Each structure stands twice: as C-alpha cells, then as structure tokens.
C-alpha cells in the first residue's frame, strides 16, 4: 500500500525500479537511479536487502570455492612479516604459564589443520578462530610488547583481506 524508502502510495506516473531480492518497487529518484541508468544493471538490490546480503556472508555455508579462499587467506597470513608469533602453538618452554592463563589457545597451524579437514561450515567460525589468536595474544602480552603489536597489525591486515571474500 505504501512503497519505497519514502513510504508513499503507488503512483503510476513515476518510474519505479524493482528489487530482484524482495520484489518491492522503489522510486528511481529515491535510490539515485535514472531510467537510462537502470538499463545497465541486470539485478537491482535495494538498501535493506543489500545490507542483509552483506550481513549474511559470514553465516552462509562454505562452498568448495570458499575453501579455496580460506586456504589462500591462511597462506597470506602465514607469509606476513608480523605472523611469526602465530605460526605454531605456543611452546610451554618459552612461556611456562601460557597454558594456565590462556584457556582456548589457537594458532595458524591448528587453523590450517582445521581447513584441511573441512572443520569450518561458515565463515564466522574461521573468523572466530582467527580472532581467538589475536585476543589471546593481547590478553597474555603487555600492550607495549611487540607480540601485542604484532596481533594489532595482523588483525588489521586480516580484516582487510576478508573484504570481497564471498561471492
């Protein structure tokens, strides 16, 4: 009865564009799209639906192609200059109290094993394990320590590398 982001009655004198996801119609004007502009995109996706698609990328099942992606992402992390602390499980000999302080240890080799055995079913689970690596480090190590700074840098890197991951 009311349409578009503007919540107005249907007016057949006006140009509408239809969202291919929700099938609701939107004034071309309210979405910044002229008629000549609409004949160049194949599938319009409206503001509300688009943010839903954005949000659900981390929750949809990991495809075979996504798994190729996780392997690449992991490889770029393992190669990063700041990833040296995170390549393997912490050695108790290097930090005798570590496994008493850190309840859920995580590291890149363990994550590689998990990718190998297709342990992850959604992107959010992979991200959760990566986030554990960084949160543990920031928890165990002082803020002025290069270990902590390495976590800060690598997390920032990872967040960038994850943009446009999923189809």
């Amino acid at each position: 009865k009311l349409y578009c982001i503007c919540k107005t009655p249907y007016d057949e004198s006006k140009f509408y564009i239809g969202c291919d996801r929700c099938q609701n119609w939107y004034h071309g004007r309210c979405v910044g799209i002229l008629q000549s502009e609409a004949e160049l995109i194949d599938e319009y996706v409206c503001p509300q639906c688009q943010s839903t698609e954005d949000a659900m990328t981390v929750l949809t099942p990991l495809t075979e192609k996504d798994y190729e992606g996780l392997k690449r992402v992991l490889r770029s992390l393992q190669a990063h200059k700041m990833a040296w602390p995170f390549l393997e499980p912490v050695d108790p000999n290097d930090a005798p109290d570590y496994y008493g302080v850190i309840k859920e240890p995580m590291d890149l080799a363990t994550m590689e094993e998990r990718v190998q055995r297709r342990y992850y079913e959604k992107l959010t689970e992979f991200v959760a394990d990566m986030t554990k690596i960084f949160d543990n480090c920031r928890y165990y190590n002082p803020s002025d320590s290069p270990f902590y700074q390495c976590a800060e840098v690598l997390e920032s890197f990872f967040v960038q590398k994850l943009k446009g991951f999923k189809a």
């Binding site: 912490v90 930090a95 570590y98 928890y139 190590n141 320590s145």
Partner: peptide, 6 residues
C-alpha cells in the same frame, strides 16, 4: 599482559 612473559 596477564602472563609472566615470553
């Protein structure tokens, strides 16, 4: 850092 250190 809650830990004794590395």
């Amino acid at each position: 850092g809650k830990g004794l250190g590395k």
